Amino acid sequence: LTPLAYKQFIPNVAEKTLGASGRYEGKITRNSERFKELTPNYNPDIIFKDEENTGADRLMTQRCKDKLNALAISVMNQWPGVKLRVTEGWDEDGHHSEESLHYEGRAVDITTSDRDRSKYGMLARLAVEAGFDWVYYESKAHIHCSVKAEN
Amino acid sequence: LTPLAYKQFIPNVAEKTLGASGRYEGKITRNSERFKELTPNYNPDIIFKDEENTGADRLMTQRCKDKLNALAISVMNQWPGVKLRVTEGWDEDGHHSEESLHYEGRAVDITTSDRDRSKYGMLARLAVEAGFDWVYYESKAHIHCSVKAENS
Numbered sequence: 001l002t003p004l005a006y007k008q009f010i011p012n013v014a015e016k017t018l019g020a021s022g023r024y025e026g027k028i029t030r031n032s033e034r035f036k037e038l039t040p041n042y043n044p045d046i047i048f049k050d051e052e053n054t055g056a057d058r059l060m061t062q063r064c065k066d067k068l069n070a071l072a073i074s075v076m077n078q079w080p081g082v083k084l085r086v087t088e089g090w091d092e093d094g095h096h097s098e099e100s101l102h103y104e105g106r107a108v109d110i111t112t113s114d115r116d117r118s119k120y121g122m123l124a125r126l127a128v129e130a131g132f133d134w135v136y137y138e139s140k141a142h143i144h145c146s147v148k149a150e151n
Numbered sequence: 152l153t154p155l156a157y158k159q160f161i162p163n164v165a166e167k168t169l170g171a172s173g174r175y176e177g178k179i180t181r182n183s184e185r186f187k188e189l190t191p192n193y194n195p196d197i198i199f200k201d202e203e204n205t206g207a208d209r210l211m212t213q214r215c216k217d218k219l220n221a222l223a224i225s226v227m228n229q230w231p232g233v234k235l236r237v238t239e240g241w242d243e244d245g246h247h248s249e250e251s252l253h254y255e256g257r258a259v260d261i262t263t264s265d266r267d268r269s270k271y272g273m274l275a276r277l278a279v280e281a282g283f284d285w286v287y288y289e290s291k292a293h294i295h296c297s298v299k300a301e302n303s
């Protein structure tokens with residue numbers, strides 16, 4: 001398998017296009033009718049940074065959960081002793097671009113647990129193989145991955 | 152004001168007596184309908200060990216939450232720079248006595264964040280003052296605290 005380059009995204013189109021993760025449907029807040037669509041991921045093979053100390057990083061859509069949980073497996077197979085790490089999932093702080101899929105539970109920013117930046121190119125590649133609908137090597141510090149809305 | 156002795160419990164009766172924390176109603180498992188009765192505690196003035204990496208230690212009943220949150224405050228007042236720490240809350244590992252209130256989200260095992268065992272006698276005392284319905288200096292390593300069911 002081939003790792004992504006810094007700033008490469010796959011598919012090589014904009015995130016909110018139909019070929020990728022598709023339309024942004026609306027921010028989901030904690031008191032919203034739509035908050036019920038998010039379920040917390042408690043997978044022990046995933047590290048959630050949760051620096052917010054709210055659990056918000058664990059919240060994501062069913063489809064995001066499926067792809068993340070598949071990725072958790074391939075990460076452990078790629079690097080014995082290493083785990084998938086999420087630094088941002090659903091966000092209620094407002095610290096992404098206006099209209100970010102994080103506000104809707106459809107995106108994660110990820111690293112490896114050991115925080116070896118040299119692994120992140122390959123991490124992104126595994127995220128693509130796990131079926132994330134858009135994967136972007138957004139930063140030296142993390143990969144951004146998103147999914148399509150629930151059908 | 153006065154710390155508990157090693158192996159002292161308060162009130163000085165069995166945990167599952169009325170007068171302490173009262174009857175064990177069934178184990179709550181993660182897929183159970185009764186799991187919705189547990190809510191995760193995200194109090195920033197409490198440290199959750201969460202060695203399971205599941206979040207299970209954060210899960211507890213409303214009453215447990217109220218008492219634990221009161222205790223978090225008195226712990227910081229007692230020892231400047233120190234916090235309440237939980238090592239076990241709700242448990243799905245099966246690591247307690249058969250019929251443990253941990254299986255129902257009604258118990259916590261606690262330490263101080265600095266892990267100074269000499270503080271634990273007083274920690275237990277503060278837990279009593281915070282309103283836990285049974286407090287037991289169960290081990291050199293931790294205090295066990297439980298609460299009554301939401302029905303009473």
Ligand SMILES: O=C(O)[C@@H]1O[C@@H](O)[C@H](OS(=O)(=O)O)[C@@H](O)[C@@H]1O[C@H]1O[C@H](COS(=O)(=O)O)[C@@H](O[C@@H]2O[C@@H](C(=O)O)[C@@H](O[C@H]3O[C@H](COS(=O)(=O)O)[C@@H](O[C@@H]4O[C@@H](C(=O)O)[C@@H](O[C@H]5O[C@H](COS(=O)(=O)O)[C@@H](O)[C@H](O)[C@H]5NS(=O)(=O)O)[C@H](O)[C@H]4OS(=O)(=O)O)[C@H](O)[C@H]3NS(=O)(=O)O)[C@H](O)[C@H]2OS(=O)(=O)O)[C@H](O)[C@H]1NS(=O)(=O)O
Nearest residue numbers: 047048049050051085086087111113115117139140141142
């Ligand atoms: O600077 C340049 O060279 C260039 O400057 C210009 O030419 C250009 O841009 S600019 O316009 O000039 O600015 C550009 O070409 C370039 O800048 C760009 O690249 C540089 C260099 O990066 S690289 O060489 O390309 O790889 C970037 O600078 C580097 O990254 C930044 C950054 O923030 O992204 C800085 O990194 C430091 O800060 C982050 C943020 O953390 S924090 O400050 O909020 O705390 C650190 O990550 C966080 O901390 C880590 C950590 O310490 O390991 C995690 O904490 C974990 O560990 C502790 C316990 O550890 S320990 O054992 O006690 O030691 C534990 O308690 C935590 O709980 C644990 N987390 S866990 O439990 O959840 O697992 C945190 O999770 C991290 O939080 S996070 O930030 O939200 O992800 C990072 O480690 C830290 N590095 S440092 O070495 O400690 O200083 C630095 O400035 C630099 O880092 S580097 O590694 O030395 O290279 C620059 O940002 C970039 N521009 S930009 O990206 O576009 O903005």
Ligand SMILES: O=C(O)[C@@H]1O[C@@H](O[C@H]2[C@H](O)[C@@H](NS(=O)(=O)O)[C@@H](O[C@H]3[C@H](O)[C@@H](OS(=O)(=O)O)[C@H](O[C@H]4[C@H](O)[C@@H](NS(=O)(=O)O)[C@@H](O[C@H]5[C@H](O)[C@@H](OS(=O)(=O)O)[C@H](O[C@H]6[C@H](O)[C@@H](NS(=O)(=O)O)[C@@H](O)O[C@@H]6COS(=O)(=O)O)O[C@H]5C(=O)O)O[C@@H]4COS(=O)(=O)O)O[C@H]3C(=O)O)O[C@@H]2COS(=O)(=O)O)[C@H](OS(=O)(=O)O)[C@@H](O)[C@@H]1O
Nearest residue numbers: 199200201202237238239260261262266268290291292293
């Ligand atoms: O008669 C009977 O039937 C019974 O017999 C006796 O009971 C037995 C126990 O059953 C048995 N345990 S066992 O599982 O059956 O094997 C054992 O008790 C031991 C156990 O090891 C353990 O109990 S338990 O967890 O199974 O319930 C517990 O261990 C303590 C340590 O002793 C304590 N050390 S300390 O220095 O005095 O504070 C402390 O560990 C710390 C340490 O700092 C460090 O660990 S270590 O390597 O030194 O071992 C480590 O630090 C980490 C830290 O873990 C981590 N954070 S986190 O919170 O852990 O997540 C982070 O901060 O990093 C640091 C540093 O790491 S690093 O950076 O260098 O990489 O871990 C911490 C820590 O875990 O807290 O605490 C542990 C557990 O406490 S905890 O806080 O709630 O987690 O207790 C000991 C013990 O003291 O006994 O043996 C007893 C019998 O005793 S005996 O061995 O003397 O024979 C007992 O009878 S009796 O006769 O003894 O009275 C009764 O149970 C029954 O009678």
Ligand SMILES: [Ca+2]
Nearest residue numbers: 051057087088
């Ligand atoms: Ca976060």
Ligand SMILES: [Ca+2]
Nearest residue numbers: 088091092093
């Ligand atoms: Ca956030």
Ligand SMILES: [Ca+2]
Nearest residue numbers: 202208238239
């Ligand atoms: Ca625990």
Ligand SMILES: [Ca+2]
Nearest residue numbers: 239242243244
């Ligand atoms: Ca447990």
Ligand SMILES: [Cl-]
Nearest residue numbers: 042205206207
């Ligand atoms: Cl949980």
Ligand SMILES: [Zn+2]
Nearest residue numbers: 107108109144
């Ligand atoms: Zn992102």
Ligand SMILES: [Zn+2]
Nearest residue numbers: 258259260295
């Ligand atoms: Zn206990």
